[PDB]
Design a protein around this ligand. Sequence first.
Ligand SMILES: COc1cc2cc(OC)c1OCC/C=C/CCOC(=O)[C@@H]1CCCCN1C(=O)[C@H]2C1CCCCC1
Length: 124
Amino acid sequence: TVTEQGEDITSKKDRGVLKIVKRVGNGEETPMIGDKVYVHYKGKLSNGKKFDSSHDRNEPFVFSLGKGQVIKAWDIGVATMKKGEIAHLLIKPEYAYGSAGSLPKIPSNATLFFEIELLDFKGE
Ligand SMILES: COc1cc2cc(OC)c1OCC/C=C/CCOC(=O)[C@@H]1CCCCN1C(=O)[C@H]2C1CCCCC1
């Protein structure tokens, strides 16, 4: 395997959000922009210095899709997912926290990885 593997799910096709489906979900419907989306996730910097999981809070992470409450890669990535799907996303800084980063959690120009389980989604 190669680091730059996965489907490029960016609109610009700049290989900045790469996705692999690890467990197939069900239903033909992905979430629409506006949906209240429920996930579990495990995230990290690619450099292995920080890890973050919804499981650390013992509760699902909830957010509204496409409202930019999360990084751009999540709005793009979760919109491709089906209920019950677990996916992996490798994210260049342009679809995460950019050259500014988000100190102290995220350094400048950081690449991020997430495993995301799409638990459920309901329309606003
Ligand atoms: C930059 O701030 C964080 C980033 C992440 C988790 C956080 O709290 C648990 C963070 O601090 C408090 C909540 C802030 C959320 C910022 C928005 O976060 C995000 O958009 C994405 C997707 C939703 C899960 C959280 N997340 C993050 O970038 C985490 C990172 C934490 C560090 C390892 C890489 C993930």
